[PDB]
Design a binder for this molecule. Structure first.
Ligand code: ZNH
Ligand code: ZNH
Ligand code: ZNH
Ligand code: ZNH
Ligand code: NA
Ligand code: NA
Ligand SMILES: [Zn+2]
Ligand SMILES: [Zn+2]
Ligand SMILES: [Zn+2]
Ligand SMILES: [Zn+2]
Ligand SMILES: [Zn+2]
Ligand SMILES: [Zn+2]
Ligand SMILES: [Zn+2]
Lengths: 157, 157, 157, 157, 157, 157, 157
């Protein structure tokens, strides 16, 4: 079913955001696991899976709308080297992705692509949940100190 | 445990092969799904997942060996527009990847990194299974013709 | 218990037929499997196992009758290169084997080896079932054409 | 997938060794069974089946590599006439076959056919297990004498 | 249904053989049991029951054919006084019985009493199993010696 | 089966490494248990058990190859007196053992003892897992400080 | 809790005896297993485990008493080359061990370390069970002869 060209372009841009997040959150997860921080491995791994699910929804929607999903262009990752830096990088990526989602959601409404809009709002709610988790962890590092914070990540929850 | 620098370079090269194949096989699968070819979606999706598992193994091994996994550089996808072209592109990608695996396996043995060698040989066996499946489907297209072949893909197996 | 020398010679000839058929039907099955013709692999494999069971019966009977089972001399296999040729070759093998079985059954009766005769009649009944299957498939190839016939072999039944 | 011609030639030689062992160990089993030595029938039958499994692995591998499995040429069996002679003949055959396996494993490595090599190492491990069983039974015959040894084979284990 | 007079005569002769074997095998079993040879009691008792079943088949067939089953004229038993002698006497009785069966089967076929023929062939197959067991035990006595053979009979199998 | 004398010598050297590690890891475990560090007792005890399993594999292999397992010569333990020292000592022991494994694996390949090679590579994979765990615990001691690290060992995981 | 210095010296001496027995009984078990003497492998393996449990009891008791367990100084093994020699060597080792235990038990009582005393008496009771089993097997070898004795060890009990 032919979709709106600019909607398809937004969906491809948001798919690009998810592709960056998939890789960044998966590498962060395995870095945490290598450091013995099993709780952070578990959470970041499941954030990666969530982004994979999002990417799948975009791919399927683009194809239904008769556009070409772009999995070729991968944006810049910002991996980082210690826990706080890694979480702050994930948070900045999420916040950037949320701005793009808000823009796309507004436009999808204007062209009456309400099914695309509805899909994107669900994704946005998911991203706001990741933001909450990231902001909270970063606050916990400040409130309890890094040593105590790291001790709290050794065991699965 | 400090690994050999060139082993790490090989693992990063092979990781890059898997990242290409993950994206190419996932997009092909959802294109098959959008065309109603459920059997092909199922197989190609599970091939994508297999490549993901391989990527995970490389990432963890690189990190154990104290290298930096490279998820930033994504090589060229070759998506293609019809079933035969898509399967032939996947086959070409697998064969290129097997050549790279063979080279890396020999080098790993020469520097006595037998655990990396053993991991890669397991991955190579997986890839040769994918090659077998692809070659066989391509032969079936020729033997029964495309119309009969497509009809055989509608229902799940 | 001492058996009749010519009966033992017939049992060794029949054992020789089964040994050819075991190898021909097993290789045919794995050729079909390699071509993705799962249904054909399944039937031909079970035909191979049936022949193995027959060979076992002859070996045990020969030994009971104080003869020497001959597993050294293997007759000529006719493998063939395409589905129809392979099935026709199996059909010819079965029909030759039934001729020999009929001759031996008649002779066993003449020397009063009724237990050997009864064993061979059960084996002949099995062989006539294989003949039926093979003749029917060859007719189906003609009635539906090779393309449709091959498509019908892709999935297990 | 096109294999190396010499590898395929090795696989066919090893297949030939398996085909000899299948027949020799199966006849030995049924000879043991006819003599009432149920424990030896059970073990030798299960060695025969194991060789059948190995032959299947070679057949499928050869076909994948686009070669022609040779089930027509059957080497020399050495049946023998009493328990010790039969076990020693099986041992000599296994030792000959292990020699050919080591040669093929080394060559498969040199041409980078690591999957064929990995298959053959698993088979070699199986053969070394049979060698252990045979050497141990032969030593037991000497240590307890043949009469006691035979008595210990009447009952299944 | 009026049967052939000579068929009935043969069935009564065979019934006579069965009645001898019932008593001889039952007495042998209880002799083995009294000597503590539990395995031999078990086998010979079950041979006796088998002969009882055969006798029942003859009695019923004779009555259907409007003849008179003769359970009055018991033939000569040969009991024997040690294990080998007892087993050799059972073997001689079975072999005599098989000879009579072969003659009766041929005659029944000649007068077209195919049901009686088929019954007798099933019985002959049972008898040939008894011959196999007896010949094998006698060979085992020779191969392991009587002392070891007897030890092997103490425990139920 | 007559094994290569220098393979047996390597297997005895590796067995020697395992015998040292069994004792050092078992004593470390019970020292941790005495200190109330139940998590470290659990891990070190299971490392000791792993080494016992490795030793059993070397002993059985040596005996199959017709050599003499040497359990008499026990190399130098380095027990240590505090948690970090104990873990550094276990790590040094593992790294020395991995070097010997790599040397032995290369040699076994050169004399075509592929089954011993394959056994050793599996053991090496296990040792690299132990190395990973030890390195990570030592990094955690630095990252969270010893007080927090000790607190994290009180409870079983 | 600070123990008596000489009690700790005795516990280390007894621990030393246990460490000799662990290795000797484990190697003997696998020698029996390699020879096909499954019953002897089973018993001697479980004697080895028993000694391991004893060693663990000594190690833990030494640590509680604030001493240093000595796992470094392995005493002399006497392996032996045939079944009777191996069993007699185990018996001599056990008897030497019992003598040391009796001395240690008396001394522990004299310095009022009744818990160490009670631990050692339980261990001595275990050792006296091993002596009983060993003395009995050695007498059985004499009473039935070695050939029959060995036959009795083939099957698990
Ligand atoms: C790159 C990098 C990467 C990696 C490493 C991965 C990995 C992974 C893993 C491990 C898993 C799990 C699986 C199993 O079962 O095991 C998954 C899943 C997964 N995944 Zn993915 N991935 C990825 C990417 C991806 C992408 C890009 C996509 C899109 C395109 C995806 C889509 C996916 C899906 C859909 C899934 C499933 C999910 C669920 O859970 O359901 N993915 N993954
Ligand atoms: C020749 C001679 C001979 C004989 C007698 C036999 C016999 C036999 C028997 C009896 C059995 C069982 C099965 C049932 O019953 O179910 C078998 C199985 C058998 N088999 Zn096989 N074989 C043989 C050869 C053979 C060969 C040659 C091969 C390949 C080629 C085989 C492959 C086989 C298989 C695959 C099987 C299945 C096994 C299992 O179980 O898994 N095989 N085999
Ligand atoms: C002769 C004629 C005759 C006949 C026909 C008979 C027949 C008979 C029958 C059918 C039965 C059932 C079987 C089943 O079910 O498995 C019996 C049982 C019988 N039986 Zn018997 N018998 C007889 C004689 C006899 C004698 C003579 C004796 C003694 C010796 C006997 C002893 C007997 C016994 C013991 C039994 C088991 C019983 C019960 O129930 O428990 N018996 N058998
Ligand atoms: C010396 C020091 C020592 C000690 C203290 C010990 C102790 C012990 C214990 C406690 C246990 C557990 C037990 C139960 O639970 O029942 C064991 C086990 C044990 N173990 Zn060990 N060990 C030892 C050495 C050893 C050696 C040296 C070897 C080799 C030779 C062994 C081999 C062993 C085995 C095989 C086992 C079983 C394992 C499993 O888990 O499966 N081992 N170990
Ligand atoms: Na069609
Ligand atoms: Na005896
Ligand atoms: Zn997302
Ligand atoms: Zn892959
Ligand atoms: Zn047949
Ligand atoms: Zn084999
Ligand atoms: Zn009867
Ligand atoms: Zn180890
Ligand atoms: Zn002890």
């Amino acid at each position: 079913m032919k979709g709106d060209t600019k909607v398809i372009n937004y969906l491809n841009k948001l798919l690009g955001n998810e592709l960056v997040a998939i890789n960044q959150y998966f590498l962060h997860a395995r870095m945490f696991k290598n450091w013995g921080l099993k709780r952070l491995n578990d959470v970041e791994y499941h954030e990666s899976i969530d982004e994979m699910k999002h990417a799948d929804r975009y791919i399927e929607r683009i194809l239904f709308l008769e556009g070409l999903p772009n999995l070729q262009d991968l944006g810049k990752l910002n991996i980082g080297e210690d826990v706080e830096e890694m979480l702050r990088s994930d948070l900045a990526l999420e916040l950037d992705g949320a701005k793009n989602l808000r823009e796309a959601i507004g436009y999808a409404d204007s062209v009456h692509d309400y099914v695309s809009r509805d899909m994107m709002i669900e994704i946005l709610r998911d991203e706001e949940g990741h933001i909450d988790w990231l902001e909270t962890e970063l606050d916990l590092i400040q409130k309890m100190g890094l040593q105590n914070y790291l001790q709290a990540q050794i065991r699965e929850e």
